[PDB]
């Protein structure tokens with residue numbers, strides 16, 4: 001499987017000879033030929049959208065792992081005052097604050113405003129450095145800088161670099177899809193992802209999403 | 221300059237100045253006599269060109285093409301949907317024993333243990349599994365749309381929007397190029413009306429909570445009494 | 459400067475390589491913020507500039523119109539419904555929508571006629587805005603002047619430029635603030651001025667995070 005060039009894998013498979021636009025040359029990772037809406041016809045808008053895709057992908061991978069991990073650790077024994085991810089933020093308003101792994105001695109956060117303030121300070125610093133560089137880079141690539149972000153050195157060969165780019169963007173698209181799912185099915189179900197999987201495995205035919213289909217009907 | 225019967229619209233097959241109101245420079249525009257500077261890329265060559273690109277989203281010709289295809293496909297799906305969201309309710313108020321004719325509740329019929337009888341007749345489709353329904357549908361519509369986007373058993377070297385072989389123009393209504401050109405406009409206009417009315421169905425569901433024909437009926441009962449402003453305070457933040 | 463290459467930018471010092479090649483410091487408010495690349499085409503850029511400025515002007519008017527009645531409300535005027543996100547429901551009251559509380563001023567009773575007149579006049583004026591009319595056969599789509607400058611503030615090009623920047627910046631501020639009005643009316647259910655009063659009463663406890671667990675599904 002090629003992942004590049006004209007004979008690359010495409011998002012409709014065999015159905016995909018004449019659907020791909022002329023501007024989606026197999027140059028960039030994850031180019032399956034999906035621009036039915038034509039939103040990436042301009043190469044500059046295409047570059048900006050590629051950056052958005054990759055950053056959303058990386059953030060979504062981190063977030064998918066961060067929503068899965070505490071729940072797994074929650075049933076595997078560990079105290080998690082609020083393990084479910086869509087209420088993990090409301091721990092600040094509890095009696096003992098947000099203890100990290102349940103340990104009252106680890107972080108013991110009590111004020112959300114100060115937490116948020118530090119977060120804006122350092123996130124702004126880091127994202128500005130990401131845009132225009134800084135202590136970990138001056139004129140590197142906006143997406144794959146390397147140097148300080150390859151302490152292991154996985155991608156010094158261009159072919160390994162390309163295949164790992166594809167792996168990155170695909171795990172990331174998977175994570176973005178899965179995070180969208182987390183959102184919609186938290187809103188719909190009101191339970192965690194792991195508990196949704198447990199319930200689906202307990203009764204797959206009558207514990208699926210269609211059980212929550214008549215939930216949002218107006219009914220006067 | 222003409223005679224009475226040509227003013228009255230007689231003598232079909234006199235149509236080359238009747239495309240002038242739907243194609244070309246001096247056509248009808250989105251604000252009529254109050255839309256002066258149409259976007260230069262909306263030259264009047266495509267059907268439904270009223271000069272409306274206030275947001276400039278179709279400035280690139282290729283994304284304009286993709287948006288045209290999106291528009292027409294949405295239009296066709298919305299026409300089918302606008303017809304299908306009113307046919308069951310009309311048929312039920314005429315007396316067909318449909319168990320849930322309201323469209324935003326029509327999907328919940330498959331969870332009743334009598335199944336999803338089509339016209340309320342158990343001898344008909346009688347679907348019980350929504351998952352099997354969805355699987356059949358996914359297989360068929362995937363084949364169907366993949367055939368649409370590149371070609372398939374119903375013609376491969378055809379247009380992406382108006383294939384018009386013997387499978388999609390089997391009545392030959394569009395063999396006259398002028399009839400074709402004006403039928404394109406009729407298609408896109410009925411379809412834009414259907415898309416607007418389907419947005420209306422969606423909003424009238426989320427807001428009103430009744431069927432669309434029920435809304436029509438309660439509006440025709442006492443219009444000034446009952447309107448969309450009746451439900452204006454419904455989404456009050458409490 | 460607010461123009462040219464050495465202009466103020468959206469990320470300040472960390473903004474040298476974060477601006478596209480097409481965002482030359484030609485237009486007001488160009489801080490170099492097109493991370494999404496939505497204005498790469500100059501024509502789409504022009505249309506988006508018009509949308510920005512019109513949204514800005516409408517949002518300034520609306521911000522003032524949501525702040526003013528509430529101020530006047532506690533300052534001593536009754537205002538049957540002073541809060542802005544229920545100011546429209548006054549038509550369904552007993553005496554209709556009285557402007558400043560005065561039953562003698564407007565005394566509007568029908569919302570459909572109000573709306574009809576509004577569509578009439580608004581369509582006329584917005585079509586005149588797009589293609590001109592009694593107040594401008596051939597002017598700029600955004601800064602026409604010549605009847606929209608009875609005071610004549612912007613006959614000098616430099617004053618014109620700086621007032622353009624001031625306009626678009628007050629307008630971006632108002633658009634942000636109006637978005638805030640929306641989200642925090644939906645979240646809080648109270649007016650903007652009352653939200654400020656409550657924040658000033660106890661800033662550390664009745665900030666937005668007090669309403670954070672409001673939209674949790676909880677099965």
Ligand code: CHL
Pocket residue numbers: 009010011012013014015032173357358362363366
């Ligand atoms: C030939 C068979 C084949 C078919 C039919 C498809 C079809 C698809 N592939 Mg694809 N692929 C196929 C082969 C292959 N794919 C891929 C690799 C990929 C990738 C990497 C990706 C795809 C994606 C897609 C999707 C893009 C179209 C879309 O977004 O649907 C849009 C239409 C719908 C979503 C309609 C909904 C369908 C369903 C009936 C929904 C049910 C309706 C709900 C009840 C409605 C809810 C009600 C609400 C409103 C209240 C689509 C499902 C993309 C994707 O996953 O996006 C989703 C994608 O990223 N494919 C490979 C490897 C080379 C293939 C090998 O042959």
Ligand code: CHL
Pocket residue numbers: 119120124125128466467468469470471472489630
């Ligand atoms: C060097 C420091 C510096 C930093 C870090 C920034 C940062 C920013 N400036 Mg900038 N500026 C900076 C210097 C300067 N600025 C300006 C002039 C301007 C202007 C005119 C504007 C900006 C704007 C912006 C923002 C654009 C990116 C954005 O939209 O945020 C995106 C990132 C976030 C929104 C993160 C949010 C943080 C927080 C954690 C969110 C909370 C999460 C929620 C709880 C989750 C939501 C819950 C859901 C589920 C409901 C960004 C915050 C723009 C702006 O105000 O947009 C908002 C803008 O219009 N700046 C000048 C004058 C020359 C500067 C001088 O140094």
Ligand code: CLA
Pocket residue numbers: 177178180181182184185188189195196197199200207208209210212351354355358
């Ligand atoms: C790969 C990602 C992924 C995975 C593994 C799951 C897994 C699950 N989801 Mg989630 N979900 C996802 C993505 C995912 N979802 C996305 C993207 C959305 C937004 C559309 C949702 C929205 C959603 C809702 C609203 C609900 C679930 C629910 C569920 C559970 C029951 C399955 C179900 O009802 O199907 C629903 C699946 C979808 C709506 C779309 C996902 C599309 C899949 C990945 C592709 C089809 C693969 C499938 C095996 C092929 C079936 C063919 C045919 C039958 C159609 C199950 C644990 C339900 C739950 O909590 O039950 C306990 C529930 O209420 N999900």
Ligand SMILES: CC1=C[C@H](O)CC(C)(C)[C@H]1/C=C/C(C)=C/C=C/C(C)=C/C=C/C=C(C)/C=C/C=C(C)/C=C/C1=C(C)C[C@H](O)CC1(C)C
Pocket residue numbers: 034035036037038039056057059060061062063064065066067084085086087088089175176177179180
């Ligand atoms: C391609 C194409 C083509 C054509 O042309 C057109 C179109 C169609 C348009 C296109 C498409 C597109 C799409 C589909 C998109 C999607 C997106 C997504 C899904 C995203 C996500 C995304 C996602 C994401 C970011 C995510 C993220 C996450 C995160 C951060 C997390 C966080 C967290 C966590 C951990 C948990 C805790 O407790 C808390 C919190 C804080 C919560």
Ligand SMILES: CC1=C[C@H](O)CC(C)(C)[C@H]1/C=C/C(C)=C/C=C/C(C)=C/C=C/C=C(C)/C=C/C=C(C)/C=C/C1=C(C)C[C@H](O)CC1(C)C
Pocket residue numbers: 272273274275276277294295297298299300301302303304305322323324326327414415416418419
């Ligand atoms: C032009 C312009 C210009 C400027 O520049 C910019 C702008 C403004 C942006 C633009 C505009 C645009 C617009 C307006 C759009 C719209 C759209 C729509 C409305 C769609 C719909 C759309 C719609 C649609 C598809 C619809 C569809 C439907 C369907 C399928 C149906 C289905 C069904 C039915 C039958 C019933 C049953 O029981 C169920 C169901 C299942 C439900």
Ligand SMILES: CC1=C[C@H](O)CC(C)(C)[C@H]1/C=C/C(C)=C/C=C/C(C)=C/C=C/C=C(C)/C=C/C=C(C)/C=C/C1=C(C)C[C@H](O)CC1(C)C
Pocket residue numbers: 491492493494495496513514516517518519520521522523524541542543544545546632633634636637
């Ligand atoms: C720049 C950029 C860049 C990159 O590239 C991309 C992106 C990111 C996309 C972009 C961004 C954008 C944005 C942020 C936007 C925003 C917007 C807004 C906020 C608007 C507002 C807007 C706003 C507005 C109009 C407002 C308006 C207002 C009004 C009318 C008002 C009215 C009223 C009032 C007085 C009150 C009373 O009782 C009633 C009523 C009737 C209610």
